[PDB]
Design an enzyme around this catalytic site. Sequence first.
Site: not given
Ligand SMILES: O=N[O-]
Ligand SMILES: O=N[O-]
Ligand SMILES: [Cu+2]
Ligand SMILES: [Cu+2]
Ligand SMILES: [Cu+2]
Lengths: 336, 336, 336
Positions: A92, A95, A97, A132-133, A142, A147, A252, A276-277, A303
């Site tokens: 493992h 990474d 970001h 993330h791995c 993974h 992960m 949401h 809202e969303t 949503h």
């Molecule tokens: O760039 N792939 O995590």
């Molecule tokens: O927020 N559920 O429609």
């Molecule tokens: Cu991993």
């Molecule tokens: Cu809704």
């Molecule tokens: Cu990535």
Amino acid sequence: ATAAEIAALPRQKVELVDPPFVHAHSQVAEGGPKVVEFTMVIEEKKIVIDDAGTEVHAMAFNGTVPGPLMVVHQDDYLELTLINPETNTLMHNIDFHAATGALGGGGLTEINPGEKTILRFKATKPGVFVYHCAPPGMVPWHVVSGMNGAIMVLPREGLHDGKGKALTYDKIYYVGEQDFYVPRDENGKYKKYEAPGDAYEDTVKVMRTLTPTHVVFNGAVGALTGDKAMTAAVGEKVLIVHSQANRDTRPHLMGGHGDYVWATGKFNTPPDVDQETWFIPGGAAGAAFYTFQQPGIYAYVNHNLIEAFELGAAAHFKVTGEWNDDLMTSVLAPSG
Amino acid sequence: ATAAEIAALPRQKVELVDPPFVHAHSQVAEGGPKVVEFTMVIEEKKIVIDDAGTEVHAMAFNGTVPGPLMVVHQDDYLELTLINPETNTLMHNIDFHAATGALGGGGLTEINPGEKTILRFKATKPGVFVYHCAPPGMVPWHVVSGMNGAIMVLPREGLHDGKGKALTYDKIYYVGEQDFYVPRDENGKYKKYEAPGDAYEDTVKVMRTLTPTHVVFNGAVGALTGDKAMTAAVGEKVLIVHSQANRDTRPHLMGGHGDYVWATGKFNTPPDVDQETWFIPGGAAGAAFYTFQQPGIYAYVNHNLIEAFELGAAAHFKVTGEWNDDLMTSVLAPSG
Amino acid sequence: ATAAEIAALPRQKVELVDPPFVHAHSQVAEGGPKVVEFTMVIEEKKIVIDDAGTEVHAMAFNGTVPGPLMVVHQDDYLELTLINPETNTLMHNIDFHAATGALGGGGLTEINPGEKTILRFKATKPGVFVYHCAPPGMVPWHVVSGMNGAIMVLPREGLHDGKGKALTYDKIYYVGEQDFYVPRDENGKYKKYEAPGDAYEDTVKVMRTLTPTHVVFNGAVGALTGDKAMTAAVGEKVLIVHSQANRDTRPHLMGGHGDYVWATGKFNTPPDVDQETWFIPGGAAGAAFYTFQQPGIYAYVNHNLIEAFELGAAAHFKVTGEWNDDLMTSVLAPSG
Ligand SMILES: O=N[O-]
Ligand SMILES: O=N[O-]
Ligand SMILES: [Cu+2]
Ligand SMILES: [Cu+2]
Ligand SMILES: [Cu+2]
Ligand SMILES: O=N[O-]
Ligand SMILES: [Cu+2]
Ligand SMILES: [Cu+2]
Ligand SMILES: [Cu+2]
């Protein structure tokens, strides 16, 4: 900064807490840049993701899915001691970001079972970011085995709205959303395995359909509901960090809104308002700030309602306080 | 505002009109806050969604899919009398994403066949918002059976661009996009059912594939084409409100653009400009403002072209006026 | 302006180059508005898209998938001579999302094999825009057969950040992403066909599943990796134009970021900043500006990692230069 200058910086050891809670920290930086230290042990373990007893062979940072939220401030250094126990079976790495270079640190942190490594990177950009791995040749496997997690790099001066006014939260929750691809047998029943490696081939076939069998928060259907519902009170300001390392999501808060939402998750990009969303693309983290105005139960969901209510992507908030009839009132209750 | 103050406010009864049209309203608010009254009867009804005659047991607000667009101004109160006729067979309710509290009003409007209810809420945030039925435990099924629409809460001073310049449209259309999941038989032919309940199990199975069989505007393939195509003229300013209560969409006006697009649908969030294709996540409404510059036919589509042209998400605009050769001209018509 | 004025503008012919490279151009416009002439010949040809010899009957502008990036400045006119050789079997045309009128020019450029056409349009809006073939009735089939590309309409004064500071790149790459839907026989083997038309029915069936069999950059799995990796040096500023004519994508530079990202692809919309993973909806192009800070290999991918590592959407950047230990350093290498 020079190696010497970095070596002279104060160090602070942080103790991580399991999602959706976040470790103690201060919104506004306390003092100058420091080297914030974290340690995570990787745990390959079985997790039950639904009420039918469906199992996933999780590859969990710190033992949880998602991995815990790590919080630092812009220009602090994040120093992670990552451990792969001899009890595990796969190599493992990690990474970030948020980091710059060597595939987010993935190229410098490849550890076999029985090994550990220490990576340090400068958190130069403010915002929430996924980590993330990513083992060469087995990246998505993974990640979709749980992960991944996220970190938050707060501006040194804390959060602010688009016009510079400070935005200070009372509470913060971290919702990690996970798409799972569990193989099924000839009778539509989910299969079980006694080794992570054993399920690889079957899992890849499901992954290729780009159709998850489950989409859950905090690793399982109902993980953030009932007793594990998140809480707040009328008047409280809450920051909800949400990540999805592999697939798009559209958060949401049913009954509420995202007053301020850094949908891209980056604090130097002005937040959207009155949402809202909102939308978070696979491979990113986002953050929404809301001040509760009504008491009661709120559903926090992805949503695409099939994903939320058929596949598992639904969480609850239980809010205390006085009901506001100006905002909403039942003029005539359901009746004949 | 106190109960007494709200009771003293003027009231205006509004007559709803069927989509894509919008009831009469004023862009700039006339006078102070009002309690705007709407009434909608829910109709569980069979509808045909394509030329082959495919049937859907729709659950329709005001008898249409999508439900009608309700228009109010910020800080007005929206008072909805919702009726569930005894001829229906299911309990229904309504969740306004524009509202604050009780799951958008869902928790206060659960009405069984033979019942009615009146809900009032303060429209505190400007923008377009989805509203949809959400009966606990049966949420996505009602929504993808067409039980959703949108409302528009205009700023009291009308629309403005990101820099404060007024944006006044000459006309407005509301395009509700609906994802349907219709069961098929062993021959790949869509199935028909006597009662809506008979379709539940088979429909849920299709829903779980997250792959709609139809994606349509105004309830059916081609509903906004031919004599029902939308219309405009060169120089005319048109606002197109678009909603999708369950699934993402990416509207595009072929031959035109989105001069100003509130992709998130919230008016306090500055609009993107000169858009080719914008994005509205499932569970939200968005709005685009465009001034037509060329006459002729335009295709308004969800730009996943398979969804637009194979599944049904395509509408047309017929535009009158003079052709502009400065903007575009055929220097050499197709020839050998 | 006047008819005489357009007639009197200089005409300039530009030679195209195949993606991911871009033809010569100036960031800041040189001189006043010009009619920039391009010529492209359409090629229907079989191409291999993966390591298993999988074939697709591509419909390629200028013989490449994606078609080449055309670059002009705002208010220049783009005049394209489009040629469809008698050796082809289908009618084709072209729709420029950057253009205004006649379905982006599609209604004026329908050419049968043995015909050519010349279209001119004024590039009134700055940004990167998709262009794609769109024959009435078979629009998605041509697009998902690879008949799409993008153009960049630069502001006459070059690019600027959200604060008005100039952003000048050292190099630019154009990554076109393509979703392919290749039929398989009952054994799971990809099918091959004699003529493009022979595969129509089988292909539409796969298209309706909304699940591509391959998602690739520059027309094939691994096309932008290894000896064909894109390159840069530490300190170099790079603009990465990315398009997807039919389906959503979420670009991410592993080990880097998008310092400034015009996610909607439109330059009058301020760019998002410090992005980890951005989002480009199907039917659009976007552009990211990054200054490399670390040497080494980077993975540029569509961050639904299954699409990137199982389906083909992964490219590499090979960057030369000095490692920056301040930004990132291995404090303790992997060890027992
Ligand atoms: O760039 N792939 O995590
Ligand atoms: O927020 N559920 O429609
Ligand atoms: Cu991993
Ligand atoms: Cu809704
Ligand atoms: Cu990535
Ligand atoms: O670009 N298709 O409407
Ligand atoms: Cu209902
Ligand atoms: Cu074509
Ligand atoms: Cu198009």
